[PDB]
Amino acid sequence: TAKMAFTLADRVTEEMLADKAALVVEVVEENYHDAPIVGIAVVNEHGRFFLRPETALADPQFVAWLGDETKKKSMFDSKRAAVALKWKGIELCGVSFDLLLAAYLLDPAQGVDDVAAAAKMKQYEAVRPDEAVYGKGAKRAVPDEPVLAEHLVRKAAAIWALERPFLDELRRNEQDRLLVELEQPLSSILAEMEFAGVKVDTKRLEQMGEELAEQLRTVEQRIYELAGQEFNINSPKQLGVILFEKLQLPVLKKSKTGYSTSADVLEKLAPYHEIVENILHYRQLGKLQSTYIEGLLKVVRPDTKKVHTIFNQALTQTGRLSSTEPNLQNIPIRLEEGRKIRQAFVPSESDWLIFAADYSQIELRVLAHIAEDDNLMEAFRRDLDIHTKTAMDIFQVSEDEVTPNMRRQAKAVNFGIVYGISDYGLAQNLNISRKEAAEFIERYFESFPGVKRYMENIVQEAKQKGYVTTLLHRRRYLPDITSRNFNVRSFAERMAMNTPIQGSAADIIKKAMIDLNARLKEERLQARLLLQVHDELILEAPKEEMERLCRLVPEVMEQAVTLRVPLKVDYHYGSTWYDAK
DNA sequence: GACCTCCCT
DNA sequence: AGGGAGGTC
């Protein structure tokens, strides 16, 4: 039942500082920013050691071992440790293997988020799930030293044992370089971006809040004035009663528990009553208020007026990053009212500016490359407007004859083609029939027979191999590709179509980040990566570096990989993120 | 805490 | 196609 052998050290010794080791720097708080490090474990050829962080991190030897690149560490989720240590003024170097990132690449669907889950992949179970040790939610606590220490040593021991088999399988999948040269170096770069953070103009945000608060009072009362009664507009029950009982509005869609009040459904009810337009407007504002003024203000650090996101680099099934606390990959841009929120994200130093660079149509360009569709590749070699070109082709008209509605619909098809494309899926999106939506898809394929071929071929490959891959050898297993349930098989077919596109795009932007970081250092620029939003990079830099960045950044991003079509990068800069358009 | 719309790329 | 993050039992 019990205890693995280890030295509960009272001070740091030399044999703890070997040049190969499994290391655990445990930060139990979910948000690791400026968070406590609760204990340390080291396992190496000389044994297993638990150290107290107050001891270890006050020790010159240990700190210098941490920062020594030639001293190789094996860890789980090294970025967590790295950041927590940065907030304490200590550099972590020499991380040559990260089990979290290794597990993520081997199979992203396992949802590996702790050492235990990773260990299980190789029939190793001599370690506990963090959830069992720390608890979950309100009962979540750091346990007493003997339980804590044994757990960190078991995790370190698991890392030590598991490196070789993980690396072995990564190599067999041709994923070794993907780990060592892309994801691991990216992890350090993300660490720097998170630590640096983004400066927020809180005063600006707060006055926006106030404008909104007063706009919401007005609409809220107008809504009660129109419903002839007061009610909870946010309630699914109360509103559905006002809409579909008291006002007799027609029921166009019924959800699981009742009537749908989604924006798509409401937009269609607006002609019937003046209440509907005010409810939409109320929700748009309420969204900005709750999610983007209030939400953001509670995560700004009052000391520096910065937000420090955490990028989850081991979550998405596609190889994309996610962003949390705050999520800075969903800041409004589409609607001008919401876009103004970006005026609150400002450079962290005076006389600095925000620089934003974004790939133009990277997904469709990746598709052109992997499908080798002659027409699509030509379209991009001509740097055509792709939605216009797709319109001309599916409706068989000249540039002159393409109407704005034709272009809107071709665009929707382009998106749908990217996401796997179903007559029913597009039909819903375009507010039209499943037949006829099928006519569009069919028509598209007549113009892009290479894309059609790719779609068919990749689904067959998914079935044959059990998975699909990206440009840089990221893998996604698709076991549902064989189910006899149409809906479940279909979704897996869509993932088979989409994942090489979206995943290859993720691959390219990650390499660009790595390449950009190396060029920034080589050039001695003070410019720093602040954020990544799937197909764009956001930096801040002195005004005096703008001109050099205008050349340097797009170029690095464009040259990250060489495809059969060119990659294209647009860029802008300004006093705020908003103005960097 | 666990089941059930709207913002982004 | 991927994500993150108020009412209600």
DSSP state letters, A184-252: HHHHHHHHHHHHH-EEE-HHHHHHHHHHHHHHHHHHHHHHHHHHTS---TT-HHHHHHIIIIIS-----
- What is chain A's Cα-based Rg? 27
Is A269 annotated as belonging to a binding site?
no
Phi-psi region of A181 (alpha: psi -120 to 50; beta: other; left: phi over 0): alpha
Query: Which residues partner with A21 through β-bridges?
Result: A73
Which helix (H) or strand (E) segment holds residue A558: the answer is helix A546-559
CATH number at residue A247: 1.20.1060.10
Q: Are residues A553 and A452 in the same domain?
A: no
Give the nucleotide nearest to A310 (CA→C1'): C4
Q: Are residues A32 and A133 in the same domain?
A: yes
User: Residue A274 CA to C8 C1' — how many Å?
Assistant: 28
Q: Contacts of strand C, CB cut-off 7 Å?
A: A 232, 234-238, 286, 290-291, 294-295, 312, 315-318, 320, 322-327, 329-330, 419-420, 491, 494-495, 498, 502, 534
Which helix (H) or strand (E) segment holds residue A78: the answer is helix A78-87
Q: Are residues A141 and A103 in the same domain?
A: yes
Is A419 annotated as belonging to a binding site?
yes
Asked if residues A100 and A170 have their Cβ atoms less than 8 Å apart, the reply is no
Q: Are residues A446 and A558 in the same domain?
A: no
CA dist A80 and A210 (Å) reads: 36
Instruction: List all nucleotides in chain C with at least one atom under 7 A from a protein Cβ.
Output: 1-9
Asked if residues A155 and A119 have their Cβ atoms less than 8 Å apart, the reply is no
Asked if residues A316 and A169 have their Cβ atoms less than 8 Å apart, the reply is no
Tokens 């990260």 map to which residue?
Answer: A98
3-state SS of A463-518 is HHHCEEECCCCCEEECHHHHCCCHHHHHHHHHHHHHHHHHHHHHHHHHHHHHHHHH
User: Residue A286 CA to B5 C1' — how many Å?
Assistant: 12
CATH number at residue A392: 1.10.150.20
CA dist A565 and A368 (Å) reads: 7
Resolution to 1 decimal place, in Å: 2.3
Q: Are residues A12 and A121 in the same domain?
A: yes
Q: Are residues A242 and A292 in the same domain?
A: yes
Contacts 24+ apart (CB under 8 A), A122-131: A122/A162, A122/A165, A122/A166, A124/A158, A124/A161, A124/A162, A126/A4, A126/A154, A126/A157, A126/A158, A127/A151, A127/A154, A127/A155, A127/A157, A127/A158, A128/A154
Asked if residues A445 and A453 have their Cβ atoms less than 8 Å apart, the reply is no
Q: Are residues A354 and A389 in the same domain?
A: no
**Structural domain of residue A409, as residue ranges?**
362-505
Asked if residues A165 and A122 have their Cβ atoms less than 8 Å apart, the reply is yes
Of the candidates A519, A563, A559, A556, the residue with the CA atom closest to the CA atom of residue A537: A556
Phi-psi region of A230 (alpha: psi -120 to 50; beta: other; left: phi over 0): beta
CATH number at residue A565: 3.30.70.370
Which of A172, A195, A218 corresponds to the end of one domain?
A195
Q: What is the DSSP letter of A317?
A: T
- Way it was determined: X-ray
Which of A310, A325, A341 corresponds to the end of one domain?
A310
Give the nucleotide nearest to A534 (CA→C1'): B9
CA dist A510 and A36 (Å) reads: 30
Of the candidates A149, A158, A194, the residue with the CA atom closest to the CA atom of residue A53: A149
State the CB neighbour count (10 A cutoff) for residue A151. 24
List the beta strands (DSSP E) in A502-579.
528-532, 536-542, 569-574
State the CB neighbour count (10 A cutoff) for residue A123. 7
Of the candidates A159, A118, A160, A152, the residue with the CA atom closest to the CA atom of residue A6: A152
- Domain count along chain A: 4
CA dist A325 and A305 (Å) reads: 14
Give the nucleotide nearest to A253 (CA→C1'): B5
Q: Are residues A79 and A137 in the same domain?
A: yes
Is A528 annotated as belonging to a binding site?
no
User: Residue A225 CA to C2 C1' — how many Å?
Assistant: 41
User: Residue A537 CA to B8 C1' — how many Å?
Assistant: 14
| Pairing outcome for strands A72-75 and A20-26 | parallel
Q: Are residues A347 and A282 in the same domain?
A: no
Q: CB-side exposure of A72: number of CA atoms within 13 Å?
A: 9
- For residue A542 the two structure tokens come to 């002195």
- At how many degrees (to 10) do helices A99-106 and A145-172 cross? 40
Which of A470, A505, A540 corresponds to the end of one domain?
A505
CA dist A116 and A113 (Å) reads: 8
Is A342 annotated as belonging to a binding site?
yes
CA dist A114 and A376 (Å) reads: 43
Q: CB-side exposure of A503: number of CA atoms within 13 Å?
A: 26
CA dist A416 and A423 (Å) reads: 9
Q: Are residues A468 and A522 in the same domain?
A: no
Q: Are residues A387 and A405 in the same domain?
A: yes
CATH number at residue A74: 3.30.420.10
Q: Are residues A252 and A262 in the same domain?
A: yes
